[PDB]
Amino acid sequence: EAEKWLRRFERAPDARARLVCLPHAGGSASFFFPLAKALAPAVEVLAVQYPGRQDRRHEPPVDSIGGLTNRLLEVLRPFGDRPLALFGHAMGAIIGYELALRMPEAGLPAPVHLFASGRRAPSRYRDDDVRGASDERLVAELRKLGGSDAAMLADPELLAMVLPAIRSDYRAVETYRHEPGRRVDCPVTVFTGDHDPRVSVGEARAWEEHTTGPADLRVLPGGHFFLVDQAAPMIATMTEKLAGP
Numbered sequence: 731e732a733e734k735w736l737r738r739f740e741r742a743p744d745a746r747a748r749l750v751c752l753p754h755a756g757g758s759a760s761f762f763f764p765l766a767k768a769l770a771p772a773v774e775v776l777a778v779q780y781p782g783r784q785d786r787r788h789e790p791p792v793d794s795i796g797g798l799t800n801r802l803l804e805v806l807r808p809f810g811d812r813p814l815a816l817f818g819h820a821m822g823a824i825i826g827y828e829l830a831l832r833m834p835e836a837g838l839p840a841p842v843h844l845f846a847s848g849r850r851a852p853s854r855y856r857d858d859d860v861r862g863a864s865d866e867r868l869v870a871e872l873r874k875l876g877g878s879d880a881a882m883l884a885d886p887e888l889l890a891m892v893l894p895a896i897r898s899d900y901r902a903v904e905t906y907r908h909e910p911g912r913r914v915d916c917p918v919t920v921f922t923g924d925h926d927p928r929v930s931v932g933e934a935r936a937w938e939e940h941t942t943g944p945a946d947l948r949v950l951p952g953g954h955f956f957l958v959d960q961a962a963p964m965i966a967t968m969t970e971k972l973a974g975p
């Protein structure tokens with residue numbers, strides 16, 4: 731079951747760290763294929779494939795962020811024989827955070843780093859009536875990813891197969907409620923787009939309130955999907971953070 735959830739596009743047997751990579755609500759494991767190539771051999775990428783995406787399109791979407799986290803903790807166990815860092819974008823950032831919080835009590839060594847991309851701090855909310863994604867937002871964000879994910883849009887048969895799950899997960903993201911007063915103990919490095927309407931700089935810096943460790947905010951040029959255009963400076967930052975304590 732572990733490799734149905736986790737895709738290893740580039741084996742790196744001598745890697746000093748594994749990086750669990752969690753996509754946004756629309757995204758699939760394949761989004762992270764170039765990162766896997768980029769980070770190996772020093773870091774081994776484990777790209778997460780949520781139920782309902784790509785090859786898992788026939789599976790029902792998860793019941794909640796809580797449930798997804800529960801299921802992912804069990805899946806990550808076999809991979810705990812080396813240090814785990816988490817990278818997540820938007821929805822993925824939330825799950826990354828919840829994983830990080832739960833890992834030690836679940837019987838995994840504490841994560842070595844949390845990279846939170848394109849997401850306001852877990853304690854930060856907005857009174858904006860956003861309880862899910864509009865169809866126009868959903869499609870816009872798929873197009874932005876390019877690759878196999880954007881390709882679905884010219885494939886209405888396959889799009890029909892994955893839409894229910896993607897919609898459900900966007901609703902999960904807005905139904906999400908953090909546990910107040912919790913902090914991870916690992917370093918948190920925050921990536922955010924300078925003109926992302928969904929994440930303000932204050933909201934991004936507020937991740938410092940969710941760790942007892944160092945918090946490093948990096949604002950990069952771009953919107954909600956800045957990470958596509960800004961992969962190089964991000965990868966430079968990630969490789970350095972993961973090359974030391």
Ligand SMILES: [Cl-]
Pocket residue numbers: 754755756819820821822900903
């Ligand atoms: Cl999302």
